[PDB]
Amino acid sequence: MDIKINDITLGNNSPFVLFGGINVLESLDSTLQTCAHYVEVTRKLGIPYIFKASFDKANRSSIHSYRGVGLEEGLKIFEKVKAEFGIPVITDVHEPHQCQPVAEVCDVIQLPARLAQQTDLVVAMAKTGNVVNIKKPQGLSPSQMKNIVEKFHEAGNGKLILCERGSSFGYDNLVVDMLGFGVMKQTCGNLPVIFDVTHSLQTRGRRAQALDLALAGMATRLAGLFLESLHLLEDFLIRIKALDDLIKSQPIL
């Protein structure tokens, strides 16, 4: 099943889409700057692009840590991104009451992995009618993602993306099961599956790692990737696109 996000076609047999941006929104200017870099790089390589940021850092290291610009100002910044660059955007939501106002602006809304079993949040997200990115919890098996999907379907929204972000491996470590992508396609109706390489590595030189992991996941035939930014983003994306184009050219077996 493909999903149309404005003029972008997201699907497991379509050219991969890049989801990327910044961790937390800090100001309009630094956001536009970062977005412009991703736009410039993705445009010249011919890769569809969706800009990602959080308006709120929900898990702060301190009760006094900077939390980001917050919802009202964050939505202003997202509106400016869309106007300046004409691309879709994606953000995460953490409370049911945030879903409707966020969805008025953001093309894709994201269900954080730790909250993926929170029924009130699922229902509120579904009711927006927006495209939803479902982050797979670190402790959920790939074959149980279908139970989340079933909830969203019961709540009336089928525009769902499934997003791998690794599985708990002992204490304080993650592993990515490359067979999970296939299990999720098979059991969830071939909804688009994307790979959050950044969060999959959070516990693991490091640029080489991200590239190896991204290549491995994209070899399994996926709708898209998350990655964070001398020209390392372009060097990564060149290689990713080469592999994606090759894989997408082979008939499915």
Give the interface with Cl ion as residue ranges (CB under 5 A).
62-63, 113, 137-138, 151, 154
- Least Å distance, CB 44 to a copy of itself, is 18
Kindly tell me which of 35 and 240 has the beta carbon lying closer to a copy of itself.
240
Compute the distance between CA of residue 183 and CA of residue 221 in angstroms, rounded to an integer. Answer: 12
Count of helix runs (H) and strand runs (E) in the chain? 9, 12
Residues contacting 156, CB < 8 A, separation 6+: 126, 127, 129
First-last CA distance in the chain? 17
Contact partner, 211, from Cl ion, a copy of itself, none, Cβ < 5-8 Å per class: a copy of itself
Q: Residue 232 is encoded by which pair of tokens?
A: 């390392």
Q: Which stretch binds a copy of itself (CB under 8 A): 38-46, 72-80, 82-90, 133-141?
A: 133-141
Contact partner, 250, from a copy of itself, Cl ion, none, Cβ < 5-8 Å per class: a copy of itself
Q: Is residue 212 within 8 Å of residue 6, measured between CB atoms?
A: no
DSSP 145-190: HHHHHHHHHHTT---EEEEE--EE-SSS-EE--THHHHHHHHHTTT
Kindly tell me which of 43 and 67 has the beta carbon lying closer to Cl ion.
67
- Least Å distance, CB 206 to a copy of itself, is 11
* Of the candidate residues 181, 188, 198, 226, the single one contacting a copy of itself (CB under 8 A): 181
Window 186-225: contact mask with a copy of itself (x via CB under 8 A):
---------------x--x--xxx-xxx-xxxxxxx----
Kindly tell me which of 21 and 137 has the beta carbon lying closer to a copy of itself.
137
Residues 61-100 that bind a copy of itself (CB under 8 A): 61-65, 67, 94-95
Q: Residue 205 is encoded by which pair of tokens?
A: 């030189």
Task: Give, in order, the Cα–Cα distances in Å from 166 to each of 105, 129, 148, 219.
Answer: 29, 27, 17, 16
Q: Is residue 140 within 8 Å of residue 165, measured between CB atoms?
A: no
Residues 150-169 that bind a copy of itself (CB under 8 A): 150-151, 154-155, 167-169
Compute the distance between CA of residue 245 and CA of residue 171 in angstroms, rounded to an integer. Answer: 37
Kindly tell me which of 6 and 143 has the beta carbon lying closer to a copy of itself.
143
**Using CB under 8 A as the criterion, which residues of the chain lie in contact with a copy of itself when the complex forms?**
58-65, 67, 94-95, 114-115, 117-120, 122-123, 137-144, 147, 150-151, 154-155, 167-173, 175-179, 181-182, 201, 204, 207-209, 211-213, 215-221, 235, 239, 242-243, 246-247, 250, 253
